[PDB]
C-alpha cells in the first residue's frame, strides 16, 4: 500500500518528439475515399511528450495533469504497463476512474478509492508453470459508493520476459467531453531500439464510459517482478522489467483525416504545425500545388481591456440623507425623488459602516452595474424589535399600519445603530 520502493529514484521530466501520433476517429461515423476536416482534442504533431522508463534504479510512477485530455504511447516486450489511475484527488474524497489489466480481463470501476503512495499490481513465485497472474492488489485499499462497473472479455496476458528489440507498441487516448469519457486503443508489432518508430497509426474506440467525473491528474501503473530466489521487503524490495511509456497532452486542433477505400486513415495533417498544413486545411486537400494561396487572416490581439468612463461627479447627497440631522416619523415617512445625478454605490455598500444590509430581488453587486428608471428613498426610525417587520409580505404594527413593502419590492433595506 504505502511502502515505498527501495530502488526508486526521481528523474527530470525529459521530453521526446512524436511524428504523427494523436490521430483518432472523432466518432463512429464511417467515411472512405474522402478527406474530412474535424476539430477536437488532439495531440499536435511534432509535439513534446514526457520521456519515462521503468528499470530496476529509476521507477517512474509520476502524477501528471489530465487537463482536458492526454495521449499515451509505450514500447513493450513483456508488457510491463498494467493500467492507470484517474481522478481529481485519486483518493476517497471523490470518485476516481481506474483501468487495470490483471492478467484475466480489463476492469473499469468508479468508486471512492483509498490513495496509495505507489499503487500497482504484480506477481510472485512463478516456477514451473509460467502463469504471471495477478497476485497482490495494491491499487487501492478500499472502495465505496460505486456508480459504475465494466468488464471486458477474458483473455490471457503474457508477461514473460523476452530478449531483443521491442516487439509491441500500445497507444491509448484519454479525453473528457462534457464529462463523457472516450477511450481509444491500437496495437501493432514493431522492431525498435529506442524512442518511438517512424510511421502512422489510427486508434479505435475500446469502451464507452459515460461517467461524468472531473479529473485533473492521473497515474501510470507498472508491473514488477518477484521470485522465490531474490525477494525483498514488503513491498520495497520488488523490481519491474524494462519498459518505456510516454504521455502527451491533447489540444483543440483541427485535422484533415484522409480515408482510404476501406475507411482506414493513412495520413493526417495538423493545420497549426506547418504553413503547408494550413494551406492544405484551407484547400481541404492533402496535396498542395506550386503557387501562392491565401490561407487565413492575421490580426493583432488586444493587450488588455481599457475602460475610460466619464466623471461620476455631481452625486446626489446620499451621505447627507443617511446622516441628516432629523428623520421623519415611521407613519410620516418622507418620499424623496432622486434624479438628475449620478450614484456611487461602492462607498455605501462596501464600507461596512452599517449594522445590517440586505436586498430583495437583486444582489447588491449587480445593482452597481444597472441603470434604473426611478429611485425612491424612504427614511424612518423604528424600534429594534420592529426592524424585522421591514420586508416584503410582512405584518405588524409597522408593516401593516405604518409602512408596507410590496411582495414584488425590488429595493434594498438599510439599518444601523
Amino acid at each position, epitope marked *: 500500500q504505502c*511502502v515505498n520502493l527501495t530502488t526508486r529514484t526521481q528523474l527530470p521530466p525529459a521530453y521526446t518528439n512524436s511524428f504523427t501520433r494523436g490521430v483518432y476517429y472523432p466518432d463512429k461515423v464511417f467515411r472512405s475515399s474522402v478527406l474530412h476536416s474535424t476539430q477536437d482534442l488532439f495531440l499536435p504533431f511534432f509535439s513534446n511528450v514526457t520521456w519515462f522508463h521503468a528499470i530496476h534504479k529509476r521507477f517512474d510512477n509520476p502524477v501528471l495533469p489530465f487537463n482536458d485530455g492526454v495521449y499515451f504511447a509505450s514500447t513493450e516486450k513483456s508488457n510491463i504497463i498494467r493500467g492507470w489511475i484517474f481522478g481529481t484527488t485519486l483518493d476517497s474524497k471523490t470518485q476516481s476512474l481506474l483501468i487495470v489489466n490483471n492478467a484475466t480481463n480489463v476492469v473499469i470501476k468508479v468508486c471512492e478509492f483509498q490513495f496509495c503512495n505507489d499503487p500497482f499490481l504484480g506477481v510472485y513465485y512463478h*516456477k*514451473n508453470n509460467k*502463469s504471471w497472474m495477478e497476485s*497482490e492488489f495494491r491499487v487501492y485499499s478500499s472502495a465505496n459508493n460505486c456508480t459504475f462497473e465494466y468488464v471486458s472479455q477474458p483473455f490471457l496476458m503474457d508477461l514473460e520476459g523476452k530478449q531483443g528489440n521491442f516487439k509491441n507498441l500500445r497507444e491509448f487516448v484519454f479525453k473528457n467531453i462534457d464529462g463523457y469519457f472516450k477511450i481509444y486503443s491500437k496495437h501493432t508489432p514493431i522492431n525498435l531500439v529506442r524512442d518511438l518508430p517512424q510511421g502512422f497509426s489510427a486508434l479505435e474506440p475500446l469502451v464507452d464510459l459515460p461517467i461524468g467525473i472531473n479529473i485533473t491528474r492521473f497515474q501510470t501503473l507498472l508491473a514488477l517482478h518477484r521470485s*522465490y530466489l531474490t*525477494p525483498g*521487503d*514488503s*513491498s520495497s524490495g520488488w523490481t519491474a522489467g524494462a519498459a518505456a511509456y510516454y504521455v502527451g497532452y491533447l489540444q483543440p486542433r483541427t485535422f484533415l483525416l484522409k480515408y482510404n477505400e476501406n475507411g482506414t486513415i493513412t495520413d493526417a495533417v495538423d493545420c497549426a504545425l506547418d504553413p503547408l498544413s494550413e494551406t492544405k486545411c484551407t484547400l481541404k486537400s492533402f496535396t498542395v500545388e506550386k503557387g501562392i494561396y491565401q490561407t487565413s487572416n492575421f490580426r493583432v490581439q488586444p493587450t488588455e481591456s481599457i475602460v475610460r468612463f466619464p466623471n461620476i461627479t455631481n452625486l446626489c447627497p446620499f451621505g447627507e440623507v443617511f446622516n441628516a440631522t432629523r428623520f421623519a416619523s415611521v407613519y410620516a415617512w418622507n418620499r424623496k425623488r432622486i434624479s438628475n445625478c449620478v450614484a456611487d454605490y461602492s462607498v455605501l455598500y462596501n464600507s461596512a459602516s452599517f449594522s445590517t444590509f440586505k436586498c430583495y430581488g437583486v444582489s447588491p453587486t449587480k445593482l452597481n452595474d444597472l441603470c434604473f428608471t426611478n429611485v425612491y428613498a424612504d427614511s424612518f426610525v423604528i424600534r429594534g424589535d420592529e426592524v424585522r417587520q421591514i420586508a416584503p409580505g410582512q405584518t405588524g404594527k409597522i408593516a401593516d399600519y405604518n409602512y408596507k413593502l410590496p411582495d414584488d419590492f425590488t429595493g434594498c433595506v438599510i439599518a444601523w445603530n
Partner: antibody
Amino acid sequence: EVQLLQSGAELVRPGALVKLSCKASGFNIKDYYMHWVKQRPEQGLEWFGWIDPENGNTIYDPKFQGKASITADTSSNTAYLQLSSLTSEDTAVYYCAGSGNYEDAMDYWGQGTSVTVSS
Amino acid sequence: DVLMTQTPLSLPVSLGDQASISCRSSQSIVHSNGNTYLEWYLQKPGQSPKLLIYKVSNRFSGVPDRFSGSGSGTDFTLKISRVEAEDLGVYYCFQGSHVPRTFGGGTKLEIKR
C-alpha cells in the same frame, strides 16, 4: 527474538464457530506473510492456507475450501482465523507461522492451539 | 494439489551417527533458475515444528551446522552429520512458493540402545 502467541485451547460444539488469534511480536505484521497448519495424531500435519495482511488475499486447501476465512489486524499485530460449521473431524491442534521477508528463508511457529469439537 | 510420500516412517541413530530422511513429490518443484523450493520442519516433544533447512541447499539461521539437505528432482534426502540427543522429533517436508502448500507424512527419530 521473533515469537508467536496463541490461545491455549478452545472447546466448541458441532455446528458453531471458533475464533483463533496468532499474535505477532518482534516483527511488523504488515510486511510479512502469514500461515496456518493443522496437526492430527494419525494424519500428521495438514495445511490450512496463507494470508498476506498487506494484501489480504487467501488460498485454502481444497479439503477446507469454503469452510474457513482468514483475517488479520494490522493495528493489533495479531492474525485471526475463523472456522464455521464445525464437526467432529475438525478436532486437531492448530499452528500459525509467518515472518517470511517475502522469502522462504525465514519462518517461525507458535506453541500451537488445541481445539476439540464435541457436544 | 500435490502429494508427498516419506520413507522410512522412523529410523534409529546413535549419538554421532548419520540420519537419512527422504521425501518424494508428485510434481517437479525445480524451475528454470536451477534452485529448489522446499523446507524442512522438526517438531520436538512438547514443542511446535521448527524450520531446519530452506531451499534444500541453505541452512536456516541459528540451526546447528550438522543439518543439511541435498538432492535433485522430486527425490531429496536430509543429511545430519552427527545426531545429538536434542534431535528427537518428527521430520517434515514442505513445498512453498505460490501453490496450495502440502505436507509430508512425517519421519520419527530415535537413539539406538
